[PDB]
Amino acid sequence: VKLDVDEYSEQTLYCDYGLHLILFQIEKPSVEARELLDVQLQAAYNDYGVSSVKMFMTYPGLQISDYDIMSAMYATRKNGFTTMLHAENGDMVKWMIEALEEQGLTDAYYHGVSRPSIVEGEATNRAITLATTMDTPILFVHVSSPQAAEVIKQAQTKGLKVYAETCPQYALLSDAITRCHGVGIDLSSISESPFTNPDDRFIGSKYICSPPIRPE
Amino acid sequence: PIYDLIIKNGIICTASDIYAAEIAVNNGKVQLIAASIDPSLGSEVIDAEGAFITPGGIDAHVHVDEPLKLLGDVVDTMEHATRSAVAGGTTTVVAFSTQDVSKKGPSALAESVKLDVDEYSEQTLYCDYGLHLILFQIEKPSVEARELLDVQLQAAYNDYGVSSVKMFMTYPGLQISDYDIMSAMYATRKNGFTTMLHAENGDMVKWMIEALEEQGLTDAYYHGVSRPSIVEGEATNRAITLATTMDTPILFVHVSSPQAAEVIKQAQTKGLKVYAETCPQYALLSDAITRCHGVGIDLSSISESPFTNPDDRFIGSKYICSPPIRPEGTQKSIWKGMNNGTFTIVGSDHCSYNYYEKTSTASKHRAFDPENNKNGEFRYIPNGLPGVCTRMPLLYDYGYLRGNLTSMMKLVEIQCTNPAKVYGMYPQKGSILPGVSDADLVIWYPDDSKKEYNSKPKLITNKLMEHNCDYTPFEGIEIKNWPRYTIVKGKIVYKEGEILKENADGKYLKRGKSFMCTPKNEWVTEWRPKYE
Amino acid sequence: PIYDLIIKNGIICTASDIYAAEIAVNNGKVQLIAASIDPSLGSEVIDAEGAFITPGGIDAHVHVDEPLKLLGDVVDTMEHATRSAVAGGTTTVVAFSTQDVSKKGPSALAESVKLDVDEYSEQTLYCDYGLHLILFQIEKPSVEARELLDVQLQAAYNDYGVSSVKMFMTYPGLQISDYDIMSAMYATRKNGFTTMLHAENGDMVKWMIEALEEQGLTDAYYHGVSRPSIVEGEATNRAITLATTMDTPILFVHVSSPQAAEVIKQAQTKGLKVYAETCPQYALLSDAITRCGVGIDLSSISESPFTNPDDRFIGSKYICSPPIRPEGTQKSIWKGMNNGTFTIVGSDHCSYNYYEKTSTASKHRAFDPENNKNGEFRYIPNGLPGVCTRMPLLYDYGYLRGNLTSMMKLVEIQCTNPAKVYGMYPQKGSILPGVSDADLVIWYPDDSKKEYNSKPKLITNKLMEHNCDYTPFEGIEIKNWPRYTIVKGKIVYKEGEILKENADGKYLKRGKSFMCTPKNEWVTEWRPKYE
Ligand SMILES: O=C1CCNC(=O)N1
Ligand SMILES: O=C1CCNC(=O)N1
Ligand SMILES: O=C1CCNC(=O)N1
Ligand SMILES: [Zn+2]
Ligand SMILES: [Zn+2]
Ligand SMILES: [Zn+2]
Ligand SMILES: [Zn+2]
Ligand SMILES: [Zn+2]
């Protein structure tokens, strides 16, 4: 946390900022590692008032196992942290990326094809199951999947402490904007997109995010 | 005479019909169904005395001792397991071939099956057997590997008629990633294989075992605590999601979780090809039997358990299996699943380790090995129950007679016919079809009779099992019916408590592709496999 | 010869098995199944040429002309309906007996059945028929209601073997309150009857019809608009709640709504004894046919709003209740058939002429100016002819085109389950030596290059062998048809010809269904006095 605070203390800041901590390297076995991960969160909180931890279930180098998530959840619950998860199944994303590339389907549009809503639904379900077993309040970041929203809703109805975040782009944009060809933005009104600039085959990259902008 | 065997005065039960008729058998096969068959036409005549005649049971989840020792030493050979099966009215078993990771190339998986077939061809076999293939080592990356895995499945099917693959989502050394499951599913769908999954979250099981041991909670009872139903629910959900993405028919083995049954049910309602197996133990036993303290067994009537032997702190190991026997209140949901179409089939997950001998490599007490840092902790308990024998009578009694199953037709569907259909053994196996069926038949005792049958057992005992294990978890309980005759390929192999060894002529069974396992051709995205 | 009939070279299909074997028939019954039967042992031998042999279809939802004229004048008699059934491979029909509110006392309901049995005993019957009882007048208070109803049901069963009762939650004069349904359920459960419900909310239907008429929205298309799926969903939910409270096995007839299928499915998963019927029209047609993949290419249908757009009244051909649903609904009907939601499939056969306008049995009955009727949808007689096309439609669009999983599922829902749920099993519905009436259908072979002049390519009115002047499926392709329909051991239909000399159908006394014994599960501690 110090690296960021020190860097930004040198810049002109127009409003206040806080910081979440991202965790991608978790010590194993869990029990041995317990005392340090606990103590490390305590220090982060005591020194810098960081009380949230972010983790990923996808992305090479960021994706962590369910086992490691449990280890982290043990620490975060004990410390009253806000636990955040990017819930997409990394294995499915990885496998499907390779399958598409093998067929030469590598244009920006296939980013969405590589990871349909069901992938986000699965990981979210799995993450709720972890959080339940671990009795840990959990927040899902940038939710975009109906299936994810459904299991989140069911958890909330049960009274489990499951919170969620969504983003404007998931309510306002559909994946048609990532390639050539009413509760949202009229996509034809957007300037400098595949619709307006069909020749620029790379322009869909403007709207590439994770999880992807979803189908109509 | 023109027929080897005539069965008279019986009631035929199939997966869809119950009716009084008679059967003639010749050259190992069902020949004829008619109202009345002249007894002079048969060499042997059996008077069923009003009892039900069912097809022989087909148990597609049996674990036998095998050369690669995947589950360590198991007490039953194929000889022992088929003898036990026939004493309990099961006439076909399907066991498991362990992937031999020492073999490489196109023939590597055919070679894995070869080890088992060769080993068993030297044993006395009481009924036929087929083999599933177990896969735990999958080549990566996905694509690079496609050519060979596909080719390896083709070879296994072409050489040995293996058309099913079993995979694990839990157990150290067996658990494979979602990535690898997808790679396998690519190959199995292409090949029309039956894809099987043991769906428990291994990471969650692993983590929770470590947590419990840290607290010294290592008794047999905490086996269940280490892996609640939600764990099985999660993995099942995840596996359905993979199968959907991959458009691959999938079967869940030994389902025990309400949450797993729920997501399975929902998939079936959507029309996805998702099949499921459960086991008697999941309907009949609760986890109270693993430590000392109406839709199932009165646990107090079971002999030699923590209830009867409270001092023996290790005796709970008799009932340790995976997934675990569940808490009270779960069992009713298992019967519901059986009735409502959730469970396509019922197997035993037969897997035997001795309890009353402590020294051998096939003992439950294998968990005590001070020299290997093993002191009887639940983690080290060999998982499994003997159950190939008791499977059919248990569902006959506790299912049909006691009203937990809706009819005898439902019983035959899940115990006989669907197992054959889903594992490519139909129509040769599973039914009573003149000119077509192997004459694999069970004649029960009549239910409404006041006649005494000295041969008819009242209680389940270890001796009744005809197996190589020294215990059965169902020791001491009442059993209201049993096979009176088990007929395997036209011959009486079991009659009124006696095994007829001279009639043992079981053989390895080459299976076909299941008609239930052709893909739905429905996809989540526009992506299709190259070969489509 | 020791057998009347031998069927060789065929593939037997049952509700659980498909296999090559041969059948011998004698004295009206299945006598033998074997690999090969000596042709010299039979008086008649049929070479099936590799084709499927199924049990005859059992259509448990057929409407015939009856003396009390509940549905006004219907064009088909029992004679016409059984002839049509047999031409399409159905060998047992179950029609309906209208409660005669003029008959009083313990025998009141047996006497209602008597009217029909007596009327039909005088007609040529091509196959067997049973009867359901329709109830619309229930006595109050409940304690009296449920008690005479007890004795009246006993008499109906004892005299005529009627073991099913049909009730409505919609239609003026038919609709009964939940209170009355409970009274009837008390009686039917006590008597092990099969209880049937037409579950649409009548109040909502009534209100919405008046609302549409007020806006002048009276064309045939607005029949669907007046009663969307949510209306069927609601009533079905309400009826399950009643059946649960009353611990009474229940069957929903002609289910068409995804919402109704949903609550049905949920009940079934719970283990509640809730059965359901759907109909080919609900999987095959969408409501676009009433005005101007999964099922029928609607443009291929002849004489519809598409082909005759000037004829503003032609949509009436496709008006039924519940209505043919909007596009996108049809797939869920096939899913229900495959997943266990629908126990059975019937036709809800109910015929009114279209090409004659003047008779009491015409669709144009809706035009009656001196009676304040001017062709408004409300006045259109509801129903489609469907007893003939039911089996071939599922054979083709179900099995061959892959909407149903197998031939075994087809036989299960078309043949075996109808017999089981309506007390006709094992006499009917299967192929059981020494036990089954020899009611069998031999189809044409599917993968053959051989020409069969007698095999129809299109569905036409003439092919129906009925007394109606139209079929809603006129003009559409059909990829298979019964080549032989065998009824009680006799060929009644052969290669496009009805063999009237072999018509020997009879009234069918039915038993209590094993599927309709109660679950013995209750919401509260309350139990019926007799329990
Ligand atoms: O969460 C993330 C990482 C960076 N941005 C994005 O689109 N997804
Ligand atoms: O599936 C399995 C492996 C063998 N034993 C067991 O209990 N579960
Ligand atoms: O139930 C009925 C009566 C006849 N036809 C119809 O459409 N509904
Ligand atoms: Zn993210
Ligand atoms: Zn297992
Ligand atoms: Zn197993
Ligand atoms: Zn109706
Ligand atoms: Zn009707």
Short mmCIF file of N, CA and C in Angstrom, two decimals, chain B residues 385-481:
data_model
loop_
_atom_site.label_atom_id
_atom_site.label_comp_id
_atom_site.label_asym_id
_atom_site.label_seq_id
_atom_site.Cartn_x
_atom_site.Cartn_y
_atom_site.Cartn_z
N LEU B 385 -18.00 -49.00 1.04
CA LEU B 385 -18.80 -50.07 1.66
C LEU B 385 -19.02 -51.22 0.67
N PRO B 386 -19.05 -52.46 1.20
CA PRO B 386 -19.57 -53.60 0.43
C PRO B 386 -21.06 -53.39 0.19
N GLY B 387 -21.51 -53.57 -1.05
CA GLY B 387 -22.90 -53.31 -1.38
C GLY B 387 -23.46 -53.94 -2.64
N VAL B 388 -22.63 -54.66 -3.40
CA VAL B 388 -23.09 -55.28 -4.65
C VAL B 388 -24.18 -56.34 -4.44
N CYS B 389 -24.07 -57.06 -3.32
CA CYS B 389 -25.03 -58.08 -2.98
C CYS B 389 -26.37 -57.49 -2.50
N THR B 390 -26.30 -56.59 -1.52
CA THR B 390 -27.51 -56.06 -0.87
C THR B 390 -28.32 -55.03 -1.70
N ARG B 391 -27.76 -54.54 -2.80
CA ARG B 391 -28.41 -53.47 -3.59
C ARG B 391 -29.83 -53.79 -4.05
N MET B 392 -30.03 -54.96 -4.65
CA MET B 392 -31.35 -55.32 -5.21
C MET B 392 -32.39 -55.61 -4.13
N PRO B 393 -32.07 -56.50 -3.17
CA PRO B 393 -33.00 -56.79 -2.08
C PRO B 393 -33.33 -55.56 -1.23
N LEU B 394 -32.35 -54.68 -1.01
CA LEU B 394 -32.58 -53.45 -0.23
C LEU B 394 -33.64 -52.55 -0.85
N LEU B 395 -33.60 -52.39 -2.17
CA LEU B 395 -34.60 -51.58 -2.87
C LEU B 395 -35.93 -52.32 -3.03
N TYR B 396 -35.87 -53.64 -3.17
CA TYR B 396 -37.09 -54.45 -3.19
C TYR B 396 -37.89 -54.26 -1.89
N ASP B 397 -37.21 -54.44 -0.76
CA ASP B 397 -37.81 -54.31 0.56
C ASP B 397 -38.11 -52.85 0.86
N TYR B 398 -37.06 -52.07 1.14
CA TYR B 398 -37.23 -50.70 1.64
C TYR B 398 -37.82 -49.75 0.59
N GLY B 399 -37.64 -50.09 -0.69
CA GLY B 399 -38.20 -49.32 -1.78
C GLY B 399 -39.64 -49.70 -2.10
N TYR B 400 -39.80 -50.85 -2.75
CA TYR B 400 -41.11 -51.28 -3.23
C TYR B 400 -42.07 -51.72 -2.13
N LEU B 401 -41.65 -52.69 -1.30
CA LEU B 401 -42.54 -53.22 -0.25
C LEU B 401 -42.95 -52.18 0.78
N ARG B 402 -41.99 -51.35 1.19
CA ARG B 402 -42.23 -50.35 2.24
C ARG B 402 -42.75 -49.03 1.68
N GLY B 403 -42.84 -48.95 0.35
CA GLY B 403 -43.53 -47.86 -0.32
C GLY B 403 -42.73 -46.59 -0.55
N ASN B 404 -41.40 -46.68 -0.46
CA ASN B 404 -40.55 -45.52 -0.76
C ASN B 404 -40.34 -45.33 -2.25
N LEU B 405 -40.42 -46.43 -3.01
CA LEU B 405 -40.49 -46.38 -4.48
C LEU B 405 -41.94 -46.59 -4.92
N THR B 406 -42.34 -45.97 -6.03
CA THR B 406 -43.75 -45.99 -6.45
C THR B 406 -44.23 -47.36 -6.94
N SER B 407 -43.37 -48.10 -7.63
CA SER B 407 -43.75 -49.42 -8.16
C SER B 407 -42.54 -50.30 -8.37
N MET B 408 -42.79 -51.56 -8.73
CA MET B 408 -41.76 -52.50 -9.18
C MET B 408 -41.19 -52.09 -10.54
N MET B 409 -41.99 -51.43 -11.37
CA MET B 409 -41.53 -50.96 -12.67
C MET B 409 -40.45 -49.90 -12.54
N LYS B 410 -40.61 -48.99 -11.58
CA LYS B 410 -39.59 -48.00 -11.26
C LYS B 410 -38.29 -48.68 -10.78
N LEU B 411 -38.43 -49.66 -9.89
CA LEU B 411 -37.31 -50.48 -9.42
C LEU B 411 -36.51 -51.09 -10.59
N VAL B 412 -37.20 -51.79 -11.48
CA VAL B 412 -36.54 -52.43 -12.62
C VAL B 412 -35.91 -51.38 -13.57
N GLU B 413 -36.58 -50.25 -13.75
CA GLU B 413 -36.03 -49.17 -14.56
C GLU B 413 -34.64 -48.70 -14.08
N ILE B 414 -34.52 -48.41 -12.78
CA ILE B 414 -33.29 -47.81 -12.25
C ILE B 414 -32.21 -48.84 -11.88
N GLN B 415 -32.63 -50.08 -11.62
CA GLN B 415 -31.70 -51.14 -11.22
C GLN B 415 -31.25 -52.06 -12.35
N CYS B 416 -32.01 -52.10 -13.43
CA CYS B 416 -31.75 -53.06 -14.50
C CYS B 416 -31.65 -52.42 -15.88
N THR B 417 -32.74 -51.78 -16.31
CA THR B 417 -32.86 -51.39 -17.71
C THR B 417 -32.06 -50.13 -18.05
N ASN B 418 -32.21 -49.06 -17.27
CA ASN B 418 -31.45 -47.83 -17.51
C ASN B 418 -29.92 -48.00 -17.41
N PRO B 419 -29.43 -48.77 -16.40
CA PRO B 419 -27.99 -49.08 -16.42
C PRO B 419 -27.49 -49.67 -17.75
N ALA B 420 -28.26 -50.59 -18.33
CA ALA B 420 -27.88 -51.20 -19.62
C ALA B 420 -27.90 -50.19 -20.75
N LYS B 421 -28.94 -49.34 -20.74
CA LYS B 421 -29.16 -48.35 -21.78
C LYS B 421 -28.09 -47.27 -21.77
N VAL B 422 -27.81 -46.74 -20.58
CA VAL B 422 -26.86 -45.65 -20.47
C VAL B 422 -25.40 -46.10 -20.67
N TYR B 423 -25.12 -47.39 -20.48
CA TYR B 423 -23.75 -47.92 -20.68
C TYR B 423 -23.59 -48.87 -21.87
N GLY B 424 -24.45 -48.73 -22.88
CA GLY B 424 -24.29 -49.46 -24.15
C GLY B 424 -24.38 -50.97 -24.06
N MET B 425 -25.11 -51.48 -23.07
CA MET B 425 -25.30 -52.93 -22.96
C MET B 425 -26.71 -53.37 -23.35
N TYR B 426 -27.50 -52.40 -23.81
CA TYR B 426 -28.86 -52.65 -24.22
C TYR B 426 -28.88 -52.90 -25.74
N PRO B 427 -29.72 -53.85 -26.22
CA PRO B 427 -30.72 -54.69 -25.55
C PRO B 427 -30.24 -56.04 -25.02
N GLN B 428 -28.96 -56.37 -25.23
CA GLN B 428 -28.41 -57.65 -24.76
C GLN B 428 -28.66 -57.85 -23.27
N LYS B 429 -28.58 -56.75 -22.53
CA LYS B 429 -28.77 -56.77 -21.09
C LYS B 429 -29.92 -55.85 -20.65
N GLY B 430 -30.45 -56.10 -19.46
CA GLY B 430 -31.37 -55.17 -18.80
C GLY B 430 -32.87 -55.42 -18.87
N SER B 431 -33.30 -56.29 -19.79
CA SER B 431 -34.71 -56.56 -20.04
C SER B 431 -35.04 -58.04 -20.19
N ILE B 432 -36.27 -58.32 -20.62
CA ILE B 432 -36.75 -59.68 -20.87
C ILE B 432 -37.34 -59.73 -22.29
N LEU B 433 -36.45 -59.78 -23.29
CA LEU B 433 -36.85 -59.69 -24.70
C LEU B 433 -36.56 -60.98 -25.47
N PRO B 434 -37.62 -61.71 -25.86
CA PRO B 434 -37.45 -62.97 -26.60
C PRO B 434 -36.59 -62.83 -27.86
N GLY B 435 -35.63 -63.75 -27.99
CA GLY B 435 -34.69 -63.76 -29.11
C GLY B 435 -33.55 -62.76 -29.01
N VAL B 436 -33.61 -61.86 -28.03
CA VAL B 436 -32.68 -60.74 -27.95
C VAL B 436 -31.91 -60.68 -26.63
N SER B 437 -32.61 -60.87 -25.52
CA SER B 437 -32.02 -60.76 -24.18
C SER B 437 -31.20 -61.96 -23.80
N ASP B 438 -30.00 -61.72 -23.28
CA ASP B 438 -29.33 -62.72 -22.45
C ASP B 438 -30.32 -63.08 -21.33
N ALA B 439 -30.48 -64.37 -21.06
CA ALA B 439 -31.42 -64.83 -20.04
C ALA B 439 -30.86 -64.58 -18.64
N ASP B 440 -30.83 -63.30 -18.27
CA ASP B 440 -30.37 -62.84 -16.98
C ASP B 440 -31.58 -62.43 -16.15
N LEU B 441 -31.96 -63.29 -15.21
CA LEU B 441 -33.26 -63.20 -14.55
C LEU B 441 -33.20 -63.49 -13.06
N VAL B 442 -34.08 -62.84 -12.31
CA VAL B 442 -34.21 -63.07 -10.88
C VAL B 442 -35.64 -63.47 -10.56
N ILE B 443 -35.79 -64.61 -9.88
CA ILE B 443 -37.06 -65.05 -9.35
C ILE B 443 -37.04 -64.81 -7.85
N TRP B 444 -37.93 -63.95 -7.38
CA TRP B 444 -38.00 -63.63 -5.95
C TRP B 444 -38.88 -64.64 -5.22
N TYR B 445 -38.99 -64.51 -3.90
CA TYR B 445 -39.97 -65.29 -3.14
C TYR B 445 -41.32 -64.58 -3.26
N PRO B 446 -42.44 -65.33 -3.15
CA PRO B 446 -43.74 -64.65 -3.19
C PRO B 446 -43.99 -63.85 -1.90
N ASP B 447 -44.55 -62.65 -2.04
CA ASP B 447 -44.71 -61.74 -0.91
C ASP B 447 -45.89 -62.04 0.02
N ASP B 448 -47.02 -62.48 -0.53
CA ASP B 448 -48.23 -62.62 0.27
C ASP B 448 -48.47 -64.04 0.78
N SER B 449 -47.42 -64.86 0.74
CA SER B 449 -47.51 -66.28 1.07
C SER B 449 -47.38 -66.55 2.57
N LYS B 450 -48.15 -67.52 3.07
CA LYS B 450 -47.94 -68.01 4.44
C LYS B 450 -47.04 -69.25 4.44
N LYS B 451 -46.59 -69.66 3.25
CA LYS B 451 -45.70 -70.81 3.11
C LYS B 451 -44.34 -70.50 3.71
N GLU B 452 -43.78 -71.49 4.40
CA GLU B 452 -42.45 -71.35 4.97
C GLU B 452 -41.40 -71.71 3.93
N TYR B 453 -40.39 -70.84 3.80
CA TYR B 453 -39.22 -71.10 2.99
C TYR B 453 -37.98 -71.05 3.88
N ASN B 454 -37.47 -72.22 4.27
CA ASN B 454 -36.29 -72.28 5.15
C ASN B 454 -35.05 -71.59 4.56
N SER B 455 -35.01 -71.53 3.23
CA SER B 455 -33.91 -70.94 2.48
C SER B 455 -33.96 -69.42 2.47
N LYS B 456 -35.15 -68.87 2.69
CA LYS B 456 -35.37 -67.43 2.63
C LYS B 456 -34.79 -66.77 3.89
N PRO B 457 -33.84 -65.84 3.71
CA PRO B 457 -33.23 -65.19 4.87
C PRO B 457 -34.15 -64.14 5.49
N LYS B 458 -34.11 -64.03 6.81
CA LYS B 458 -34.85 -63.00 7.54
C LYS B 458 -33.98 -61.77 7.76
N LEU B 459 -32.70 -62.02 8.04
CA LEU B 459 -31.74 -60.97 8.35
C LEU B 459 -30.62 -60.97 7.33
N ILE B 460 -29.97 -59.81 7.18
CA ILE B 460 -28.74 -59.69 6.38
C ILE B 460 -27.56 -60.04 7.29
N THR B 461 -26.74 -60.98 6.82
CA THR B 461 -25.55 -61.45 7.53
C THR B 461 -24.39 -61.42 6.57
N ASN B 462 -23.17 -61.40 7.11
CA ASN B 462 -21.98 -61.43 6.26
C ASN B 462 -21.89 -62.69 5.36
N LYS B 463 -22.23 -63.85 5.92
CA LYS B 463 -22.24 -65.12 5.19
C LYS B 463 -23.15 -65.09 3.95
N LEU B 464 -24.31 -64.48 4.11
CA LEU B 464 -25.28 -64.31 3.02
C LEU B 464 -24.69 -63.56 1.82
N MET B 465 -23.66 -62.75 2.07
CA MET B 465 -23.05 -61.89 1.05
C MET B 465 -22.27 -62.64 -0.01
N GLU B 466 -21.74 -63.81 0.35
CA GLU B 466 -20.91 -64.63 -0.56
C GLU B 466 -19.72 -63.84 -1.13
N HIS B 467 -19.18 -62.91 -0.34
CA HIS B 467 -18.07 -62.07 -0.80
C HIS B 467 -16.80 -62.39 -0.01
N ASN B 468 -15.73 -61.65 -0.29
CA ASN B 468 -14.43 -61.90 0.36
C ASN B 468 -14.13 -60.93 1.52
N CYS B 469 -15.12 -60.11 1.88
CA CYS B 469 -14.98 -59.17 2.99
C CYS B 469 -15.53 -59.80 4.27
N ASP B 470 -15.08 -59.32 5.43
CA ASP B 470 -15.50 -59.91 6.71
C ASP B 470 -16.65 -59.16 7.40
N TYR B 471 -17.21 -58.18 6.69
CA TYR B 471 -18.36 -57.43 7.20
C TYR B 471 -19.26 -56.92 6.07
N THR B 472 -20.50 -56.63 6.43
CA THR B 472 -21.41 -55.83 5.61
C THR B 472 -22.02 -54.77 6.52
N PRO B 473 -22.12 -53.51 6.04
CA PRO B 473 -22.64 -52.45 6.90
C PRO B 473 -24.09 -52.72 7.34
N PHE B 474 -24.78 -53.58 6.58
CA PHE B 474 -26.19 -53.90 6.83
C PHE B 474 -26.40 -55.16 7.69
N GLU B 475 -25.35 -55.59 8.38
CA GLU B 475 -25.40 -56.73 9.29
C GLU B 475 -26.53 -56.57 10.31
N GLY B 476 -27.39 -57.59 10.41
CA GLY B 476 -28.39 -57.65 11.46
C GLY B 476 -29.79 -57.14 11.13
N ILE B 477 -29.90 -56.35 10.06
CA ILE B 477 -31.19 -55.74 9.70
C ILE B 477 -32.13 -56.74 9.04
N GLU B 478 -33.43 -56.54 9.24
CA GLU B 478 -34.48 -57.33 8.59
C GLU B 478 -34.49 -57.11 7.08
N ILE B 479 -34.67 -58.21 6.36
CA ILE B 479 -34.84 -58.16 4.92
C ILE B 479 -36.05 -59.02 4.55
N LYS B 480 -37.03 -58.39 3.91
CA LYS B 480 -38.34 -59.01 3.67
C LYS B 480 -38.43 -59.86 2.40
N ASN B 481 -37.43 -59.75 1.53
CA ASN B 481 -37.34 -60.60 0.35
C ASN B 481 -35.89 -60.72 -0.14
#
